[PDB]
Structure formats: C-alpha cells, structure tokens
C-alpha cells in the first residue's frame, strides 16, 4: 500500500559522471536537466502526489528535485537536504577519467577497487585539485573530523546513508507521508539494499537508470511487495 | 553590526500581468518577475553574501524567487523552510477579479479600503467563489485548523499569523547566529518590517517594499535595526 519514489539525477557537466564526480559539486548538463524534466512529466502524467522530499546537498540532485517538483506543480512541498544522501566520495580518483586512473594507479588496483565492496579508493590529498574545494566547503562545516571523508568505499557510503533512512525517512513513511527521494547512484543503492535485503555482490551489480522515477510499493512493515517499477515513455523505459 | 538579515520580495507574477487580485492564488512569476529575482540574486552574489538558512511561503512565486537567488549565489544546498504563515495576504472574494473592473464597479473609495486599510479585510471568499476549492481545498493547507484557514485577511490579520512563525521559528535561528534569507510577499514582509522597526499602523500602510531587490538589515543583540534598511545592486 505504501508508495515510495526514487529518482537518480541525470548527466552532469563535463562528463563528470564518467569521471568519479563524487563530492565535487557538478551541475546537471542541459541534457541531465532535460532528463529530470521528462522524469517529472512522467510523474505528472501518472498523477503522483508527495508529501515530503529528501535530497543530498549536491546541486545536481537538488536541481533534479527542483525540476521534478516544478513539473508536477508541487514546489510547495517540504524538502530536506542531507550530506548523508551524497554520492560516494571517490577520494583521489575524483574527477579522473578511466585512462587517467589506470595511468595513475595501475590496472591492478583499479580492478580491485571496481569490484570491492569495502576497499576504499585512495584518500583525496592536499595536492588534489578538488581538495580545498570539497574539504573546506561550508556545507560540510557541521561534520566532525571523523565524519568528513577523504574517501569512501561503497560500504562506507551505505553506512552513513542508512542512519538517515532509519531516523529521518522511515518515520515519515510510517505516518503515511508519500516520500520522494532525489539522490545519487551509490546513495540510492544503500536504500535499495536495505529495502530488498540484497547481498553485497547483488548491490554492486545494480545500476539504477537515471532521470527515471523508480517506484516501490511497501507493506505496513516497509517491506516491498513487488519488484521496483520504472516510469517513463517507451523509449526511455526500454533502454533498461 | 552583530546580526545580518536579508529580505526579498518576489517580482511580477502572471496575475499581475493579467491585472487580477492574487492573494493566496498560486500564480507563478512572469518572465520579467523571473528576471528580477535573477538580478537580485546576482546582486547578492556580487556582494559575496552567505546564508545559513532560508524561509519562504508555500506560494510558487516566492519559492521560485528564492530558488533563483540560491542558484545565482551558488547556495542551492542551504536548508529551506516553507510556511503558509509567510503567504501573501489572502484577498478573499476579490481573488481572481480584474482590478480595474473592481474599481469601476465599486468605486475608488471602497477599493482603496480593501487594498490598503490596516484592519478592514476584503469581502470573504464564499464556497461559491470560482477559486474556493482551488485555494481552500488545496492539500497544502490540509493541516490548518478551521480557525486558522482564512477566507479573507486585512493587513493586521496577515501580520498576526506571520509574527508567530517569526517569533517561534526565525528569531531563534538569528540568535543562534544563523544568517537568514527570507523570500516572501509584500504583506507578509510588511509585518516583519513593522515588528523590526516598530512602525505605526499608518507608517506601515505607506510602506511599499521594492520587488526583486535584496533588503538588508543590520541588527543588534535585541534584533533592533542599527540603521535603515539598505538595498543591493545598481540604480
Ligand atoms: Cl527547496
């Protein structure tokens, strides 16, 4: 009976989604913006109403949310932003393309990081071009030194996302509030993994499509009663 | 100056263009209203303003004004809190009526009272009004009590449902040293200016706040302005 909608932001500027964008605050590209607008139009056409929204503190997820709320005429909804729904922090790899990461760290290590669930990438160090940009960003000024990551394994990302799910989102759902979450590939994995009880390998194989509303139907104990559903026109929905 | 507070009134709406009374009707910004917010946002950006929290209404012309400012100053990540208590004054039965026809039919005297008297509210919005369901049945107000949901408001009414939010929700942020940005409407902001400056019924009624311009207050420890409000941008 409970309905929960997830949406993963689309394409970010400068191909950063293929360059471990991570905690760098890339904006949506105009194509990414268009993708969100189509996602929002699909929600409008399907008559979806929400009562509250959760997003990260990254502008690409926020803009995705804004674009959806505008399209569905629900700009008045309460919105809660949290760093705990941020993309995975990719450490020293942040901003590098594939050739560059291989050239830097070798195929051996890259392959290890690709498949690992709890081996973190190299920490982002003071020589990294995004070091002060991210580490000194005012939006993280309330994180303890311990909480502010220099890098994250997928397991770390999920571990700091889950508490927010549990303490902030779950209660809303239990009150029958219709939740919309606009976040990132890796933070949304955390939620799916908890919802379905997937294995570490299962979750690493899940590639959530972008720009597409992902619908969950949950029973009174917030266990899904069926597989996730994708909303959208035939061409978009097909690619999955 | 110990404290800094910034207000912004949204610019031109779609119903301003149509020459209709808006009030609680959820009219969007016109393109020119959108452009004003952008210039206001660029002014805040040029002056390097930082905020910690934002307050706005549940009305999209103000919400879009805030969004546009946040985008311009690269602070989209800020916490945003929306409340009906910052809504525009509820125009009652006048909601949706052509302003010119309203003056033609009722006369100047009567309309002046409805638009600008302090304590005399416009006629009530009755269940037969064309926008009764559109406004009074809008689920964004579903948590208001019978005694809370207005069918019309004078400026005094407006101020009276606005100040509680200000006292309970905005003042504690300010005293915590949070830098506050408020994006709202002419009448809701009138109440805040009235409270801050302690203006009289008469003075506040002749206060016409400029639109799409950052209005900057420097407050002391008691949240009393240490100087007259200032404006940001060019001329
Ligand atoms: Cl928002």
Please give the full DSSP string across B64-90, using - where no structure is assigned: HHHHHHHHHTT-TTS-EEE-GGGSPPP
Domain count along chain B: 1
Chains A, B: CB contacts within 8 A come to 32
Chain B environment of A63 (Cβ under 8 Å): 76
Containing B116, the helix (H) or strand (E) segment is helix B108-116
Minimum distance, in Å, between the CA of residue A59 and any CA atom of chain B? 6
End-to-end CA distance of chain B: 25
DSSP category for residue B166:
I
Q: Which residues of B are catalytic?
A: 10, 88
Q: Is A186 marked as a binding-site residue?
A: yes
- Residue A4: name the closest of A215, A234, A156, A155 by CA: A215
Interface of B with A in 9-28 (CB under 8 A): 26
Resolution, Å (one decimal): 2.1
CA atoms of B94 and B115, how far apart (whole Å):
10
Instruction: Extract the runs of DSSP E, i.e. beta strands, from A135-213.
Output: 179-183
In the reported structure, the alpha carbon of residue B80 is separated from the centroid of ligand 1 by a whole-number distance in angstroms of: 5
Q: Cβ contacts (< 8 Å) between B87 and chain A: which residues?
A: none
Structure tokens at A86: 């941020």
Given the residues A9, A33, A128, A184, select the one marked as catalytic.
A9
Bridge partner list, B5: B180, B217
Cβ–Cβ < 8 Å for B69, B7: no
What is the signed CA dihedral for A187, A33, B15, B214, rounded to 10 degrees?
70
Q: What approach was used to elucidate this structure?
A: X-ray
Give the contacts of A73 (CB within 8 A, at least 6 positions apart): A44
Does B64 sit within 8 Å of A76, measured CB to CB? no
Within 8 A by CB and 6+ apart from A161, the residues are A84, A85, A187, A190, A191
Residue A108: CATH number of its domain: 3.40.50.1240
- Report how far apart, in Å, the C-alpha atoms of A76 and of each of A87, B58, B62, B178 are: 26, 5, 10, 23
Cα(A128)–Cα(A5) distance, integer angstroms: 36
In Å, how far are A92, B19, B118, B122 from B114, measured between CA atoms? 63, 16, 9, 5
Q: Do B182 and B86 meet the contact criterion of CB atoms below 8 Å apart? A: yes
Domain around B92 = 1-235
Residue B52: closest CA among chain A residues belongs to which residue?
Answer: A139
Contact A4, A177 (CB under 8 A): no
Q: Which residues lie closer than 8 Å to B179 by C-beta, 6 or more apart?
A: B4, B5, B6, B50, B51, B52, B53
- CA torsion through residues B215, B220, B223, B228, sign: negative
- Report the C-alpha gap between A203 and A220 in whole angstroms: 24
* 8 Å CB contact of A66 and B63: no
């Amino acid at each position: 009976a409970y309905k929960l909608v997830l949406i993963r932001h689309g394409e970010s500027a400068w191909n950063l989604e293929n360059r471990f964008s991570g905690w760098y605050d890339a904006d949506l590209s105009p194509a990414g913006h268009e993708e969100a607008k189509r996602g929002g139009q699909a929600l409008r056409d399907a008559g979806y109403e929400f009562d509250i929204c959760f997003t990260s503190v990254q502008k690409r997820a926020i803009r995705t949310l804004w674009t959806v709320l505008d399209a569905i005429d629900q700009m008045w909804l309460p919105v809660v932003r949290t760093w705990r729904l941020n993309e995975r922090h990719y450490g020293g790899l942040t901003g590098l393309n594939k050739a560059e990461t291989a050239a830097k760290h070798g195929e051996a290590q890259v392959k290890i990081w690709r498949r690992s669930y709890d081996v973190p990438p190299p920490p982002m160090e003071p020589d990294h071009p995004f070091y002060s940009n991210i580490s000194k960003d005012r939006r993280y000024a309330d994180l303890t030194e311990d909480q502010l990551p220099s890098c994250e394994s997928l397991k770390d990302t999920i571990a700091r996302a889950l508490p927010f799910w549990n303490e902030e989102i779950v209660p809303q759902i239990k009150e029958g509030k219709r939740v919309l979450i606009a976040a990132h590939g890796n933070s949304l994995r955390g939620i799916v993994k908890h919802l379905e009880g997937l294995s570490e390998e299962a979750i690493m194989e899940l590639n959530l499509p972008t720009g597409i509303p992902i619908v969950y139907e949950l029973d009174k104990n917030l266990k899904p009663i069926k597989p996730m559903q994708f909303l959208g026109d035939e061409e978009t929905v097909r690619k999955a």
